[PDB]
Design a protein around this ligand. Structure first.
Ligand SMILES: Nc1ccn([C@@H]2O[C@H](COP(=O)(O)O)[C@@H](O)[C@H]2O)c(=O)n1
Ligand SMILES: Nc1ccn([C@@H]2O[C@H](COP(=O)(O)O)[C@@H](O)[C@H]2O)c(=O)n1
Lengths: 204, 201
């Protein structure tokens, strides 16, 4: 059954495109970045020292987390609380890479990600290492990319080209596409154009 | 005039003791941990990547911060907003060490701390590196400490090792500091003790 992995950096509209690709394939959708963000919110609220990986590992043994695989009903639950809003806040955005870098944390989420994928049948799974690490035997692997400039304009309008260009260098020396991935430059494209493009690639 | 530095780990009541010492000496009070917490709140709200020191340095060039040196009128203002509550929340508590470890950040706050101290006359300045780095020629230097056990119960051993071996500002008393074990003492007992030490030097 069909597993589509969608990876790439931020600011390209990756998440919206993956959602809409899922709807069009009648498939399920899995937002992996949201899972990291949920754990991050959990860590922040316990007040764990973010400079201490062992403390982050210890504090994330039993994160009471739930996420939907329905692209039309995405909710982020933590301890029964709907945390869809706070997991997108700047606090979590600033903290998420501290928590994501802890191996113990990845180990669990990669496992949770694999299980959700196997039990979802037809599924589009979105993130950064889906095609390389999490689901290396995906049927189709897509790497959505865009120029620094394109990505910068999508952010400064959300409300930068310096900030976005900086993060590219630190990531390179710290995002790498799988060998069998299909690289798609979305710089010139709108969302619907990107969706149609991926539908074409998948249906080939 | 008189500059009293009070340093030590967390969980001994250090801040309450330093406040009350200030009141009793008729001195001013400076809560330096608050200043790190205010910057941290600023960083968190800008959504700066905490794993990136250069980004934290860049995002903290111009932190609009204000803090009082009056022990009875402590407020923590950021961009005009009273942030006394949020700077004590867990989010900031968890993040503050990431931000505190950035040299550029310390460099500024240490400078701001020295200036506030000079202009406050008689002042008790509280923190972790006050007697060693910020005010190394304080008149009286106090290192408030307590056993792991005592500190643990007041929450109702890991952090001790990480603090000891930390890169930017490891936690160590000045050679000329007066080490005071507060394990057996209540707060008012500690206050009386420091009043005695200060009124003997
Ligand atoms: N597969 C993934 C997905 C997200 N992440 C983390 O999540 C953050 C942003 O997540 P989003 O994909 O939700 O924007 C990144 O900074 C990264 O640290 C990750 O480390 N691996
Ligand atoms: N003088 C100081 C005071 C605080 N700090 C930092 O500020 C944090 C918060 O201090 P408080 O918990 O005492 O407010 C400490 O955990 C430490 O990371 C520092 O590095 N130097």
């Amino acid at each position: 059954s069909m597993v589509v992995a969608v990876d790439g950096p931020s600011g390209t509209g990756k998440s919206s495109v993956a959602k809409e690709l899922a709807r069009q394939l009648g498939a399920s959708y899995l937002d992996t970045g949201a899972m990291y963000r949920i754990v991050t919110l959990w860590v922040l609220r316990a007040g764990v020292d973010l400079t201490d990986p062992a403390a982050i590992a210890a504090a994330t043994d039993q994160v009471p987390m739930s996420v939907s695989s329905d692209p039309d009903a995405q909710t982020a639950l933590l301890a029964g609380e709907d945390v869809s809003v706070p997991i997108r806040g700047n606090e979590v955005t600033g903290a998420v890479s501290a928590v994501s870098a802890v191996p113990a944390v990845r180990e669990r989420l990669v496992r949770q990600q694999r299980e959700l994928a196997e039990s979802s049948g037809a599924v589009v799974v979105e993130g950064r290492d889906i095609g390389t690490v999490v689901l290396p035997d995906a049927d189709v692997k897509i790497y959505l990319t865009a120029s620094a400039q394109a990505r910068a304009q999508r952010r400064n309008a959300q409300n930068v080209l310096a900030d976005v260009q900086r993060r590219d260098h630190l990531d390179s020396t710290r995002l790498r596409p799988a060998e069998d991935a299909l690289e798609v430059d979305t710089s010139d494209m709108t969302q619907e154009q990107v969706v149609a493009h991926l539908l074409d690639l998948v249906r080939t």
